[PDB]
Amino acid sequence: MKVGIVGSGMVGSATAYALALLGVAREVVLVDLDRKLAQAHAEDILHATPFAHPVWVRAGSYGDLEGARAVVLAAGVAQRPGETRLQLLDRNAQVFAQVVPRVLEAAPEAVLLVATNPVDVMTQVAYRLSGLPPGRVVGSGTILDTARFRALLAEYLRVAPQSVHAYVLGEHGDSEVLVWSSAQVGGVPLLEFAEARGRALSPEDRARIDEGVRRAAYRIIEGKGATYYGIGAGLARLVRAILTDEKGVYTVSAFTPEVEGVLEVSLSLPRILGAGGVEGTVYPSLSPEEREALRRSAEILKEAAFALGF
Amino acid sequence: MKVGIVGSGMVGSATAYALALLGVAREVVLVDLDRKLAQAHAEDILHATPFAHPVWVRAGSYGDLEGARAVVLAAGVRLQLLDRNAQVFAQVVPRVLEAAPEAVLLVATNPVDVMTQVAYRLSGLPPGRVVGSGTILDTARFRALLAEYLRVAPQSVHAYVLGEHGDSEVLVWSSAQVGGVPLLEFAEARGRALSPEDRARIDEGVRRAAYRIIEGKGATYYGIGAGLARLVRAILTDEKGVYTVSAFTPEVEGVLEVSLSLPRILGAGGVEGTVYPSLSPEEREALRRSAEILKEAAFALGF
Amino acid sequence: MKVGIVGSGMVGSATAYALALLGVAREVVLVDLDRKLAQAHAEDILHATPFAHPVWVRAGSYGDLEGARAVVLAAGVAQRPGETRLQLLDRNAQVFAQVVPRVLEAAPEAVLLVATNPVDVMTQVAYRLSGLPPGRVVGSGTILDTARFRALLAEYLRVAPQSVHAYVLGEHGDSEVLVWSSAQVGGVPLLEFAEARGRALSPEDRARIDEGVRRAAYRIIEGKGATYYGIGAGLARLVRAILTDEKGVYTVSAFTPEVEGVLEVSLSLPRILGAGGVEGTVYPSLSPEEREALRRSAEILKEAAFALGF
Amino acid sequence: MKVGIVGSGMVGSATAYALALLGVAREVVLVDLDRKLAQAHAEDILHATPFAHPVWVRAGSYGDLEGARAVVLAAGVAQQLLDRNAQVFAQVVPRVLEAAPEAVLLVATNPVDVMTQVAYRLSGLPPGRVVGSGTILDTARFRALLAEYLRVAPQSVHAYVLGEHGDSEVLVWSSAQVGGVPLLEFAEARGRALSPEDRARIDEGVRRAAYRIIEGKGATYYGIGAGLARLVRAILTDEKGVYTVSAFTPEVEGVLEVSLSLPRILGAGGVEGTVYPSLSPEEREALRRSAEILKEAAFALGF
């Protein structure tokens, strides 16, 4: 099976590196305006594959994305000195306007998996441009924050992460929501389970955890200039769900008819991911304050789509 | 790390095979009165290892269990039968713990809940240290069938089978989650409302599995072999994962000092916590009843 | 991908088990005239799968082999009281006469993987009946013995097994040829490597090791009646090689035009195994002594097959 | 087990990432002067681990290297550079062994062959304990291109690149083996004659790889990251596998006291054996000269 990746900076290349080291697919195709950036990365990574799995990583054009069952969009541009947010956004919006049609031309039946930040808006942009059903365009969304939330929760409780069920919903960013209230451990309420043991989650712990989750990206960018390793592996996992038609549940961003009163916006909710993209939503119980933080996350996101016209 | 298995019949040797194929442990020691049987299974399995993982599978004595961090008891021979097996354990358990005072005991011998209770009493260890495979195959089969019906990955399905492993085990439909939401509410949102005949169909698939396998081939071993290996992995890696395994428990639904499957946290010291699911009146009554026959079976046997 | 197995005894079922636990194919189909036996084994193994990899193991008919890319033939009958080896071979050759056309009817593109003993003659039988090119019919042959030879050499030299290249060739069994002369480690000749390692490999070490390889099957049969775990995993690896078009080198049995002058005979030589089965033979340097042992191994198989009618 | 990585740039951080995704060690510790760079890379990678294996990646000081079996030195500093880096190693090496006295030192810093010699002198350890990545990438690429050309699994191709990592490295065509048989012979059997033209194409493919990668992206790190992770794994598992890595060598073709890549057996204590292949006159002579230039470079820098 073939995976494509458009955009061969750190995020696209680390995604290819993850795909190869985990042996997710037999073929990975890097596509980038800078033909020879794509080539350098592809060849650097090919040097790694003998020490892991038989995986054919190459640089390529959109035509070489033929039969790709999933195409990662980590396209976009290197921000400029003094280039504002909204400015960079308009630029990436225009990159996608060129990327999406070309990808879908070579790989009509590919799920499009959007990585480019801000991921929720770029997801909505690629959805509108694709002219596809909304399930076929999936954004990586909050998956790393969700998993980080699970990890920190599992740690404090002393149980396996895979026993912890817990979400981060909404915008991938400042307004994301940690769903404390219907989080579970082995199928039962989490806060309550904690309590029945050593100590219930304290105010200090909750916000130490909230800060562990919420300001991770800021810490990373502050210290090294950008995040890419984390999302590389998260994208690989999603690619894996798509190629194997897993139908696992992931907090990914997609176009959603309505949420908490807000209409036609892309954001992360728990969704079932398979060979054709997201194929069902799993809406969990929310508390009134989580519900309200979500409406609010949706609206922020809706307004950012307005400013781009999508 | 070394794993021990006492009893080199089909269940024990299949566990060794699953351990080796999955690469769970670097060293696996099969111990059996019939030494030549243990050696033959060990060597057969050793020929497999170049095609999987570096795992030293061998036959040995009780003393070769020294330093083993988990030991599987698969040494099985009506409650006359159940009497013979308790006699065996009265030999096995002291000799395992002599060579390996640190080992978590993983009871596989039928009936597993009773034998888990007897292993416990004989051990003199704390209760978390003696763990019976219990209902893990049935719980997983229950999740598998539900996942298929719902068209969702089994890992998103949290459903339990609890109590006594066998005919009277309790499928806990009532509080089953999926994606963290109620099973039935999720089932409708997938356009597959669970029908009492669906519910009964699935029930049949879980409950009658072992009976079908025995009718066709005379014994079951492939499933529990892999299940025990997964359990051994949990112990060796101090996973603290949740598994519906049997352990001596102070009280279940009023019934005191009985061994049976509940959702339990499993790590390097054995089970170290219970995660008690929500039960409906029917299920609870079933469970308390299950707990009762087991309590007095153990009691008939002097345990 | 789908793999079929005909014959659901201990060899066929242990093979299904190894395929499931190692996650080799998405679907495994066991076919046995004794349907309740096939069904019992498939369902026992299906219960293992939640603890390893998603694999659909099921019992079925020849018709259910359709689209299979490899079918393991572990078909056969139990020796009766006072029946000769050669009488048994008759009855088994007859089992293959029924099996082979039915398998090919339903999965005309499958590589056939023969496991039934004596594997070399049975490979010749499968090949003649199939009507297929020689590359399509492959016997497991001596892969277990070759693997053991290497493991023993490894442990003795203190070096990783994958660094040791030693072959067991010819007829699977007492007649097999351990190729000492051209065995190499790290590319260079075994016997100095041992030297420049502070292990000389007295003639007593080679005798120890020859007994280790040659007499394993006997020891196992004497202690438990049959072997199956070893070949179950050996076969699973051959299947993986076929499904991944690996073109790896294995000492497996195939119909060979000429070996040391003996014509049209099946036995193990080093062979390249890929999606179409064996696609090349690698002939290692042989010593006068080994060459004559191989020649002689070949002509006893040639006779036995012709005497059988193949 | 714990692995240390000193130097948290792209090589050091790609290595930790490789180690994490492949699930090689349970603890990965990153050490860098720029504490925040190390912390950021570590936290970035920690976010990946839920989607691969349970691995604890973290920033730390030399003290946190306690009990590390292997420590990667990718501490080259941004640009006489030699001298510069030679000083770094004078600081780094003593600190590491203080925390991790059984630690094999794994030099990644370029030029890797001299640095491996540097690290060795300062080590005060047995020669095998200091191992430089050397030509492992080029050897693997050489095998990959040959496998591709001959239509055969890479695992079957036994071919080495030896000597100095870089433009004067030696492809050992003469004694290369596929499936145990001489290379050129196997090419025949395949009907895939290795002509001078084909060898030139393959040579360029191997020799000019890093050049091409530097030109398109500015630096190389993904490949060496996975190669180092494999070397680390060999060490942690006491594999005793054969790798073309750089190590201090008493004499090579008559040149004395020089560090360069030869096939070496790699285990828990570092390299514990050298496997010297047959060399054509051309190759032997090219290797001899390379070794000269290195032993000189080693001596002139003060090692």
Side-chain angles (χ1 to χ4, degrees), chain C residues 219-299:
Chain C
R219 291 188 291 266
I220 295 176
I221 289 155
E222 229 60 77
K224 78 180 201 149
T227 49
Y228 43 82
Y229 287 130
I231 193 179
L235 285 169
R237 187 60 183 92
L238 295 180
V239 167
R240 167 185 153 182
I242 296 168
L243 268 39
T244 63
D245 188 34
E246 177 187 301
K247 304 186 195 303
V249 176
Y250 295 92
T251 54
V252 290
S253 189
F255 181 84
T256 307
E258 170 271 324
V259 40
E260 297 312 329
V262 190
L263 304 156
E264 302 192 357
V265 63
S266 303
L267 45 62
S268 297
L269 305 170
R271 296 176 203 276
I272 302 174
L273 182 54
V278 288
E279 62 173 83
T281 308
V282 181
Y283 321 87
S285 311
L286 295 188
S287 86
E289 292 66 28
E290 290 156 358
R291 205 176 286 287
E292 170 63 20
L294 181 55
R295 173 208 74 73
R296 178 256 191 174
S297 200
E299 184 64 47

Side-chain angles (χ1 to χ4, degrees), chain C residues 158-160 163 165 167 182 184-188 193 196-197 237 246-250 272 279-284, chain D residues 151-153 155-156 158 160 175 177-181 185-186 189-190 239-242 265 272-278:
Chain C
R158 301 174 291 133
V159 62
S163 263
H165 155 101
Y167 288 123
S182 53
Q184 51 208 37
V185 155
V188 322
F193 176 84
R197 187 101 184 114
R237 187 60 183 92
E246 177 187 301
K247 304 186 195 303
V249 176
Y250 295 92
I272 302 174
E279 62 173 83
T281 308
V282 181
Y283 321 87
Chain D
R151 310 187 282 108
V152 74
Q155 71 181 317
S156 278
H158 279 68
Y160 296 124
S175 62
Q177 317 248 265
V178 178
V181 176
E185 248 181 63
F186 179 95
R190 280 316 241 170
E239 185 179 308
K240 307 181 187 308
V242 181
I265 300 165
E272 61 171 81
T274 294
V275 185
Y276 215 85
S278 186

